[PDB]
Symmetry: D2
Subunit: 392 residues, 4 copies
């Protein structure tokens, strides 16, 4: 299958590419791949483990190997022998210039960038380049996945976001104020009849306009925002207090990280998308609102080794207060990268099975899952297993 | 309903009694009570929130109020106004002298004790006092729950434990070597047609002899070992790694506590029952065996404020190792005490609904649940909800 | 001796008062009192353990017992028997209405307040009430200590802060813009020839104008900002990396707390005083600047139980990076309150020994110590011991 | 200078060798070297940064490069380019067969070993091989440092350990029962007039017999047991509670590690040497005995990445209990290896300055420092600085 990655030179993107190749060459295990669990045996009938890659970027590098290597130098998150083994493969992956339209002040942290909008292109002209890029690469087994930097909250517009007609009128009118890069890539993917997933808390296809487009086109889509680390633990652990009839009175989540993701998320406007995603999970599992504080701060020495410190203050029998602490220490690209490959496979599977619109049953992968109130990790995994079984 | 508590003067026992009374008087909330979750509405039809208490003990105190107060002085785990409010009530609860037969070297840590066996009584004579004590208290809504100190592993015997006939032959023969206090209390309870639960990892009714007895008598029973803190987190969290196809390579669980439970568990023979319970959970959820280390050490300054430190070392994508730490800081009697009341209620419910034998669907309460391979906290809670629904 | 406490109804203030009385009555130990260490034996010759209290406040309560009780209800940070024992004593302590001039937006978090400036009083008129309040209480063994809410950074003024003449010209001119409450209380104390200490990071007497005043008057003064918890650990631990020739590349300090101090510090302008104090310590001990992030966030369930999470990322041999984490869990008023009594005693001692100006050798108590580059806790304690020895 | 390393193929030993070479070649910084702090400028006059290596071992490898590489494969604790750069250098370092006499049951965990005693050699014959090995390598700038596996407590003997005459009588009598490998290597080193240091808690030269020998020969010696991680933090932090007149009521230290050191220390007899060293530090800094629990458990996934979890329970003002937690996450060989080079340099310095007997002022490096009650890290560092200054 083919995967078009928006933000193709990112650490998550390049690790997914390195990882695909290393597994295909038989020099890495299948650990971390949800699609490789016994319950999903038979997936390879519709979505075998075989990947070709293309994508959009705004940072300037020659190919995905120079990109993967840049990240590897700072993080060393796979062995040099894996880097060497996948070199000629990744050297052949060359991203196309994309759009960073309305992607927030955090974008400046990426350094040297080139964009479609910086060429003077209108919305219609940008959509045409984006679509030409993708359609030149795409086949009948192609999926588009957004792993680009996190955008700020979009400028609100009922008219331009509320219906596909309104959104297409937005493009016709070149009303850039109400468009963001993530909507334009999603629009392009769905217009081309290609399954789409959003690994970020940027809007992407999560607006009614694009939800309507996906349904009309009969195209499956999924998101938003990878649930890889702290939020995974949060949606696994929070239910434990509810099952035991305890009240969570306070929940602190402090996340520190470096690298390009920490760098963009350090900006107050970009950060807001992520912070809301992380916070709002508690109410959806508990029914009520614990005093919740969630922060992300740049901490350059950690690079891609995002560390989270959580503190849960909870009441039990006779109103007595008690304390739980956790510290999560992992490489963000390690927990994220296989999920990209898993999502591509589940999207292709769903496409072949005639699924269209929001694949709500893919909630398990996401911190802000579209069209569902299933947030509990355990319930989500059951829903994913049962969905697949019902379609296999 | 009536509850006979073996280890009636313990901190868990006395807190359950204090808590029952405080709720009944309307000066405490219902927080911590699983039987009070919306899904279990209607339980009060069969098991209303109303408790009378008796029990067995070996430590010397006048009544359960002097006992509750002893623990309260060191822990202060409920307000003085709760202590005062429940005083005359608990003053009327007077334990009967029980047996500490083969309850391990840790028993010495309890200080001044008196026992049935120290009177020179045979197994048959001890069973008769135990049964006379219970039957004098019991009615048709009475349950027996063991919350006594944790015993060592029992002396192995196929003959005396393997069948009810063999066990009754053991008593007839006064073969004390193959009996423990927890089996004798369980035997007495089941012989009297009373539902029984074991909040400890002592054998209790978890031997084939007594399992056979419960079935024959048509009596429901449950256990073993309250899952209140570290083991709860372990059975909630471990599944998260499996769902994400990660390998747990190492799991450290270090528990430090004081008070009488830490004191008895400091003894190497008693400790073994608990350590096995805590450890064996991982394999049953994962399918394989992470390098697992579990320890309990006495630490007197903490008193009943058991603190656990856990460290999970795990592999993900491309074999990369990552780290998760947690620290649990709670009052053991706070997380345990409502479960005693919940168990009494669910046992009475099951009794009225014609349930008999091991109530495997009560696994949710226990670290070593009898007759089940359902260990996952989420699966256990679903099983408990579905069980109740199917019987309501 | 007598102690005038600015912010007399605060949790630190009222705990110091409760604590003084309880020790004097012989129902509490002397634990926590630096002035009670063997090395300071003989202090009682000049500053015996004997305290009378008065002070300024802006929150509305009848006396210091109602104030201490308000905090005790939420925190329970000493036993009810201590509360009862010190009741009639604290009932006789009645604060006088003070000034909250330019004390930042965080002041609004205190609820119902009354102030001198809200009466329409000029700077000269306010200074006269403040001075009349203090001088009516003061004797030849009286000290003034500021434990009021933390102020924002003051409005900068070379002219009005740079010399005593400029500062007195500020008052004559009623130029409120360049005055804050903490400077006015400090001015009043020093004008009255009374030793002064600032337990907060508010400016207080730490401006050249007031430093000049203290010298002229021959009066000892000390500050700023109690070093009680996270910053104490930081100044104890940081030196360990320097001694071992390791480079600290990153230091995260995250502090969460509730109660009135967390409430005022939640305001972005007030918070800035504290955050700078906490951060700048590293450079002064290390010679260089680790990437340092320090935050304080309100977290109401913790009340006065401030919890800090720190993360130290450090390089050693061959440039290899390593990790250290700590979690501090204490009651802020517990670590602060004895230091108030200690400071009063050391200030009276210094006064009797003819010390005047900044008592730099009291650095040990403070996170922003005036007139010194001694920050290391170990060096500070040696300096304090040697200072006292040289004057005893 | 030359350094003879007992346990030459260990991870600490081989990292010190790799590190020496990498610095000398100018491809690594001087971070981690105490001898490279500004205060020790001028050391290079007597002990320049220049190292040749030999040593004793019992595990079977061809040379120190194959040994360093074995550890590097599992730990990756320096870059492959460092490994490559120092290859031909380390290939030329070939250990001589040593003795593992009375080195405990933990020795079995090392796998395939060959020893002098396994040849049938008496004590006198073994001492002669050990001495011939060392004297063939040694010059006038040679030091012997023990970095071999930790031994159990020795068999007690006043006669054979109490005086040099008694110890030499032990050898003459071939009384192996009262000798251990570490005493024999130390004896050999001192008999040859060579400075000696013990990086382990094995006895080494810390018996009166050998202390007497070192004095007679006019030879400087140092130890015992590297203070690199948890014990360093403990001796840095404990003083903070004393300075503030707080009582430490409990201190938990839990250490988990893998690799050969964790493997040998997993044995109950070997472990005892280390556990006593770690524990006894508190009393020497505090004057009293907090309830202290210290454990070391094998945890193979961590390899040389020893992780410690500490919990400090402490009383302050009014007897209120408070909590401090730390987690130490480092590579043991990283914090240890430069100290080996530092110790060699300080020993050579002391030798040239006419120092003889126990160099008590090297306490700073050690968890069980010989001939001193200075345990506080801050006091130790001052003593080290002042010692050097007084001799430079
Ligand atoms: N565990 C995780 O790493 C994780 C978890 C949840 C969400 N996410 C989200 O996934 C995304 C990728 O994470 P990452 O660590 O790889 O970040 P990254 O910065 O390394 O990669 C993102 C890439 O996108 C490019 N980019 C930014 N805006 C673009 C645009 N408009 N069009 C095309 N390219 C653009 C950047 O130049 C960069 O190369 C981020 O949004 C992140 O917040 C990551
Ligand atoms: N969170 C928890 O507190 C928790 C969780 C799981 C299991 N448990 C188990 O529940 C039990 C109670 O815990 P606790 O903190 O109340 O301990 P506890 O020591 O305070 O109470 C146990 C009581 O049992 C009495 N006893 C001991 N052996 C007896 C015997 N053979 N017959 C009659 N009485 C006997 C003791 O004197 C004591 O009063 C322990 O076995 C404990 O390990 C507790
Ligand atoms: N461990 C610690 O508690 C600690 C450590 C370092 C610094 N401090 C500082 O000490 C101070 C007291 O801490 P706390 O917990 O008692 O806070 P608190 O809010 O309980 O007490 C401060 C009191 O000052 C009063 N106040 C505010 N502004 C005033 C003004 N201008 N004039 C007179 N009264 C005023 C408030 O009404 C309040 O009663 C705070 O500034 C705090 O940041 C505390
Ligand atoms: N941070 C630290 O690594 C640290 C801190 C304090 C103390 N120490 C001590 O330093 C020593 C070395 O630590 P390590 O991690 O390198 O352990 P290691 O096991 O890797 O190295 C020790 C070497 O000594 C050899 N050995 C054992 N007994 C011997 C004997 N009698 N004669 C000659 N060789 C022998 C072993 O084969 C091994 O190669 C251990 O005793 C350890 O406990 C280490
Ligand atoms: Na805690
Ligand atoms: Na870590």
């Amino acid at each position: 299958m083919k995967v078009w990655l928006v933000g193709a030179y990112g650490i998550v993107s390049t690790t997914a590419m390195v990882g695909a190749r290393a597994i295909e060459r038989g020099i890495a295990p299948k650990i971390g791949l949800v699609s490789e669990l016994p319950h999903f045996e038979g997936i390879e009938k519709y979505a075998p483990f075989s990947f070709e890659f293309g994508g959009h970027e705004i940072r300037l590098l020659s190919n995905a190997y120079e990109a993967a290597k840049e990240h590897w130098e700072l993080n060393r998150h796979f062995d040099r022998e894996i880097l060497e083994a996948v070199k000629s493969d990744l050297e052949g992956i060359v991203a196309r210039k994309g759009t960073a339209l309305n992607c927030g002040s955090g974008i400046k942290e990426l350094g040297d960038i080139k964009t479609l909008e910086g060429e003077g292109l209108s919305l219609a002209e940008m959509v045409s380049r984006i679509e030409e890029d993708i359609k030149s690469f795409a086949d009948d087994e192609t999926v588009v996945i957004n792993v680009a930097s996190t955008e700020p909250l979009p400028n609100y517009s009922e008219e331009y976001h509320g219906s596909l007609e309104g959104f297409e009128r937005m493009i016709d009118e070149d009303r850039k104020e109400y468009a963001s890069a993530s909507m334009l890539y999603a629009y392009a993917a769905l217009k081309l009849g290609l399954p789409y997933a959003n690994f970020t808390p940027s809007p992407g296809s999560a607006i009614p306009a694009l939800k309507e487009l996906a349904e009309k086109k009969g195209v499956p889509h999924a998101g938003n925002d990878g649930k890889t680390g702290e939020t995974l633990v949060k949606t696994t652990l929070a239910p434990m207090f509810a099952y035991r009839n305890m009240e969570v009175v306070g929940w602190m989540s402090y996340n520190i990280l470096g690298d390009y993701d920490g760098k963009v998320l350090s900006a107050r406007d970009n950060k807001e998308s992520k912070v809301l995603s992380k916070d709002k999970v508690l109410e959806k599992m508990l029914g009520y609102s614990p005093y919740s504080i969630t922060e992300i701060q740049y901490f350059p020495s950690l690079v891609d080794n995002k560390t989270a410190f959580d503190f849960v203050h909870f009441k039990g029998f006779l109103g007595k207060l008690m304390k739980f602490y956790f510290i999560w220490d992992a490489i963000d690209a390690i927990v994220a990268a296989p999920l990209i490959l898993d999502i591509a496979r589940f999207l292709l599977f769903a496409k072949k099975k005639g699924v269209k619109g929001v694949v709500k049953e893919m909630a398990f992968f996401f911190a802000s899952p579209m069209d569902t109130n299933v947030i509990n990790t355990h319930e989500q995994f059951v829903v994913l297993k049962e969905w697949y079984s019902n379609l296999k």
